[PDB]
Symmetry: C3
């Protein structure tokens, strides 16, 4: 899995801890070995939401499967909650774009997962 | 809707105004309440286009529907025009990646739009 | 084509050269005129992979076609190799997300390729 966060708030000293905690939580929820979870946090990005510059966040989440049924709701609950708590961005100012990526469209280690 | 801009030119003092103007224009064109429009601008990114480092720009645009028929052309005209005017990046050095995202793949406020 | 690199390692003085070399190599592999290749490199991004902050990299690659059969494997070999050599990021800490984008979903020069 992959989770990339782009946030309007200033950079945080505990970015590494925040991402590591997000990484383990996401592995468990998706039923993936944490070995395969990649995360990022880019703060200080000029953003608007609803026409204003209040704290806001865009997240992209990708996985090879594991996003069936209630999973995208459950991931959103996890991710919005984690970001609310750790970055102080209200959940109603967070967007998440999900993609279930075919394994052959996912490169790793000089090849693909397909 | 979502519009994320990644540009090679230096950061601009009027990023907020630029994004707010883009936000209202995009809401109107897509027929979406501006409440739901998210935007970003990341400048100063090392980029090449056509093998050179002249001013260039990558934009991602996402929407839950509203990208039918001539819409992607019309959005491109709006976006390239806005960026040309405000960042001084020629329209022929702007790329836009569009995605019509299913509502269940769009997280917001601890849940999804599906 | 489009290749956007997001890396955890510090910014490099030779980003332009690195991207230009990647640009020509990618054009040749995909059978696209280099005119149409867009690249970027964003370094210094807080990232984890496998739960740790060792050098790691996320790449997105998009093309209008040209990603059939063995192509995504071949692109991954090229890209992981180039990044390993130039940024010192091990290939086993590199992820690549691929998308074959319909031409009508690819904006350029105030219109789309469709």
């Amino acid at each position: 899995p992959l989770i990339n966060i782009q946030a309007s708030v200033p950079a945080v000293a505990d970015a590494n801890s925040l991402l590591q905690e997000l990484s383990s939580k996401l592995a468990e929820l998706l039923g993936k070995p944490e070995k395969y979870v990649m995360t990022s946090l880019q703060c200080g990005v000029p953003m608007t939401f609803s026409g204003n510059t209040e704290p806001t966040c865009y997240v992209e989440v990708k996985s090879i499967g594991a996003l069936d049924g209630s999973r995208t709701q459950e991931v959103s609950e996890l991710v919005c909650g984690h970001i609310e708590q750790n970055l102080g961005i209200p959940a109603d100012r967070i967007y998440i774009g999900f993609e279930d990526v075919p394994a052959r469209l996912w490169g790793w280690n000089g090849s693909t997962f397909g």
